[PDB]
Symmetry: D2
Subunit: 334 residues, 4 copies
């Protein structure tokens, strides 16, 4: 009766989703797929630079690894259509490799025998893009393939919803000052996808780049589709990020206190509120999808014309992972 | 011979200005004031983490130090009314300590005997704020105390001038993604000026903060005074920064190409233009005050309403320092 | 009910000592002295870059802050002799400012009314230097001023004791590859004490420097006084360090396994043992004073002549802090 | 005679060697092989995080790119035996990919038409390993495949030669405090070669690891083969490294000044001497293979028994690259 989860891709999100599922009753990881040996998988689960030691016991066994007494099967299969998801009774696959970010591509898990697939990134094709606590109620239970959107999209959506519901959004630009990620290079080097900026030493530069929220957002809140755009500056922190959003609103006698009060009223398990002068390392490990920071709200007025600026923090690892596990549990509950 | 400069405060900008002054045959630093021994001064001139080795020879000598032959006198003065600027015939003081950022305070150097003071920061009082090649022609030669604005103001001004001249600036917000500076703390610790974010480990955080450019720009371009505002995110690079400006313009069928071409046409020794996908470290050591990056121009349109975003790089160290030494030579000319 | 502790200097060690004491019943902090406002003290207690959020509630009041209702009085006093230790019944002062690291200087707290002072650094004068679980039993309860040695000394002492006790230590050199500390500069800048290397950007360099362990260790283990020396390389991690010790021993058919087994047999609350291939961030927040790493033991032999090398990890923040709080509790229990 | 050079692998060393070569008469790169597009190759040559900007104009043309008006042909060939080295009259290939580090494997370039191959790494098989100005005079001009040793071996050789020639080396242990390299991971992630430590976030950890120097010195100075060993601590600087050697010598009334003076007497283009209290960033871009630092010499004496410690800096990028280009020009001059 526990929901049976398989994780394809045991990278940052895969491993972090495994950690969260250990704490969510009714969800169990029964299988992991990754192109590496089990000694490596167990070790990276156990030790984690930014997120901390895993509490429980992890041991490598012949067909997998035991975690707190439970067996986790590990496979090493690179065509996802060959995975034994049918023999193992998989309810949901968390698709975290980065190589199946499309509806038709992802159906390989479904051919293989899983009941549903949640992609841990924006994805192309005929599927719903879901930010828990913003549009998860769009899910009616008939879905086989779903996108969990991106980390930034998750930090943005509940802020952008309040702005548009309460004040009316005319248009806005976004910058996420964003931690470096695994697909950035350690040293100046040819990048795989030809990105001359992701080619550069990750932890020695401010590096302009694209953000997966720039397009994902309109799919999440359709009534502002086309009204927001922006990008990222990848900077030398290993996790922890900040979304700055600069907007023109319909209402035009808006104040700092009006904006702050409205965000607070919308706060919930996915959307936090803070008036403390925190910095990025202070959100490491947090499980809100977004943390609105009242100390950063700015309102600029020249005659009848206002620009409004807001900021929301997120652990681009754990915020995103917690959002994705919330979607997982909900997707499996109907 | 030569304009005689005295540098008060031998920190990042003071040392870099000395260094910049070594690149400018005919400018000479005849004196340095700082509260530290000469062995420490010479050493810090000689070795530089982000800016690299001083190639010329530096040696410590009885009254101060010898640089590539020339004697530079050094002092351990805590005040600047007691400095022997009169005996040494100082033409201009570069005021880089951060403790004299006001017209009345800075007149101490003038009482001491210097002819002019250029402050390496925004400053209060009855003085002109000057970003070279934006508003340096406001100087008529009667000034005794002048401000060189800030590093961010120097990155912002030529971009904002083009935007307002060409398209008409209604309003705008700014964020500088900015290298950490020496007044930030190494580890989480009490901060001197009470700033709970500058109190935090500089090289382990994204840290929101204030910017000079926020207040200094209206003084540089009066016709947009009050139309811009913004701040900073201090991030873990030791030098190199990026100014992002998000604006509403009067003209409202503006394009990416229109904006880019206009910046290009305005390029000069202080304002560079690039279409290369560079990153921060790529502007370490550069001498433009501002480097416009065409790859980053965005234009957002919903019906008749447009938001325009632009970005410009700067070495908050050498960009600023090079701007300040241009002003210094013009001020003395 | 409780030993009453005053912390002088609310820096890295002071603040961390405050947090450890919340986990150890019998200790309470009743006072903090530092040259900064309360809002800054509460904030830095609450938020910590490398050690994570303070779990409990922290609120500011005038002349202090409260922590879970418990009132903590705060002060601004540069000469320790004017502090109201007498009015507050202070049992032990943790001296963490760095400005009283001498027996006569530290007696200021004693003049002020505290019963005892534990200095969170090596210290000159007529005092004992203590590494918990190496030489704390030297304390007979008559001491008024005591040194808690340094973070490196605390990593080194139990390793050096085993080497000497089991094999006979002839001589040895030490390097600690050491996290940068708050008295290093952010940017190349004049250094307060005239150290041309501590003058340099802390997080952009490998920086040779002194360690407190070279002089403090002979005071901790007298029978090897003068037999060890060495220094540090300050590197760009914010906390987490590693001591490498290269020794000549009396016994000269020593093996990797003999060394390892001897460290394991000596392991305790202050001295851990690991065979896992960990890295520095893995010891962040650890409460051992030293963590011996068996994977780094080396024995070099040419004819009848052996060089032996060993390594021990420590969180130069929390290892040292945990050691110091152990000494504090023992000092007050005598 | 412009010696015609082909570079296989346009990574850190490959790109840096192209840069050195442009500063040295007699050698010219006419071809580059790498598995990436030319726009990427030109960009990474042009911009460089740690070494600064290439002086000179670089433009992308057809069969490669233009540097200072000179055409450089580029290829994207994975099968090297297929490279048109014969049609292009290649004198020497600089093998910098990391995939041909063996004599038999490297002969592929020779089958392809190149006259000689210099491998930019230690290498197995029947070949000479060369540190310029230590053992380059072993080259008699009949060699087709040669190894240029490693960056650390280059830092170590001239120091060890002086110690052995002047004092007699008994035995010694080494640690290189070493900049992170491009085969380390940006984030905790499965490592390609299964190294659980190189798997970890490069710029957030002190990471123990192996050094090529331990395997490569004995081949460079045969009379001390087997007498040295040691490893590395990879730390969060992007370039700039330090080798610490702890030795037992035959002569045993050795002094700090004796050791220092002997290093200084041996100093040359490859082997610099300093008495300044420098740090890692101060060697960035330097062209000495090794820079002996007199400020770090230590001598430890207990009765008749001495341990001597020394340290030499090196830019693991540019020191190594300058050493490699000196060997290249000598190899081609015989």
């Amino acid at each position: 009766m526990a929901v049976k989860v398989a994780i394809n891709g045991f990278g940052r999100i895969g491993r972090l989703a495994f950690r969260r599922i250990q704490e969510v009753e009714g969800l169990e990881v029964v299988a992991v797929n990754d192109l590496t040996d089990d000694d490596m998988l167990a070790h990276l689960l156990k030790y984690d630079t930014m997120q901390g030691r895993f509490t429980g016991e992890v041991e490598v066994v012949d067909g997998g690894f035991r975690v707190n007494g439970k067996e986790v099967k590990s496979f090493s299969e690179p065509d996802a259509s060959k995975l034994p998801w049918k023999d193992l009774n998989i309810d949901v696959v968390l698709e975290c490799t980065g190589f199946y970010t499309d509806k038709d591509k992802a159906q390989a898990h479904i051919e293989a025998g899983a009941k549903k697939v949640l992609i841990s990134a924006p994805a192309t094709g005929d599927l719903k893009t879901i930010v828990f606590n913003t549009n998860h109620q769009e899910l009616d239970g008939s879905e086989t393939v779903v996108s969990g959107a991106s980390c930034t999209t998750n930090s943005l959506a509940p802020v952008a919803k309040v702005l548009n519901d309460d004040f009316g959004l005319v248009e806005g630009l976004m910058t996420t000052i964003h931690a470096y990620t695994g697909d950035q290079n350690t040293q100046d080097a040819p990048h795989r996808k030809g990105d001359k900026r992701r080619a550069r030493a990750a932890a020695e530069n401010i590096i302009p780049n694209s953000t997966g929220a720039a397009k994902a957002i309109g799919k999440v809140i359709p009534e502002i589709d086309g009204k927001l755009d922006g990008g990222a500056q990848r900077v030398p922190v290993a996790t922890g990020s900040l979304t700055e959003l600069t907007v023109v609103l319909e209402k035009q006698d808006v104040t700092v206190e009006q904006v702050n009060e409205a965000m607070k009223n919308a706060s919930n398990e996915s959307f936090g509120y803070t008036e403390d002068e925190i910095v990025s390392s202070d959100v490491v490990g947090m499980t809100y999808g977004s943390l609105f920071d009242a100390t950063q709200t700015r309102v600029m007025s020249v005659g009848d014309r206002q620009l409004v600026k807001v900021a929301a923090w997120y652990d681009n690892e754990m915020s995103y992972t917690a959002q994705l596990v919330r979607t997982l549990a909900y997707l499996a509950e109907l």
